[PDB]
Amino acid sequence: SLKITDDCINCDVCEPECPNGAISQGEEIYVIDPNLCTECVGHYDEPQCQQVCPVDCIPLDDANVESKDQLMEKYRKITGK
Numbered sequence: 001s002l003k004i005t006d007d008c009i010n011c012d013v014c015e016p017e018c019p020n021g022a023i024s025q026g027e028e029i030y031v032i033d034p035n036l037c038t039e040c041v042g043h044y045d046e047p048q049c050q051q052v053c054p055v056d057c058i059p060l061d062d063a064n065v066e067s068k069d070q071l072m073e074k075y076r077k078i079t080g081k
């Protein structure tokens, strides 16, 4: 999964970009739900949130390291596809 760091400026532009609805506004910064973040695999070749973030604060989550096979399995479960 990806995660949103403390550098987030609460600009909102990533939230509508997520195909799985994984992003929401938290108490201090935006937050990714790791159960819905596929790192966009199955939808886009690259994470869509990273492409619009103005401060590049959406890195890989070190606490949630996943393979392409794992992410694609998550995509199938979320989408039924």
Ligand code: SF4
Pocket (backbone or CB within 6 Å): 002, 017, 018, 019, 020, 021, 022, 023, 032, 036, 037, 038, 039, 040, 041, 047, 048, 049, 050
């Ligand atoms: S990487 Fe893709 S699935 Fe994960 S939060 Fe960003 S837009 Fe959503």
Ligand code: SF4
Pocket (backbone or CB within 6 Å): 004, 007, 008, 009, 010, 011, 012, 013, 014, 015, 030, 052, 053, 054, 055, 056, 057, 058
């Ligand atoms: S696009 Fe980047 S700075 Fe803007 S709300 Fe999302 S994570 Fe925060």
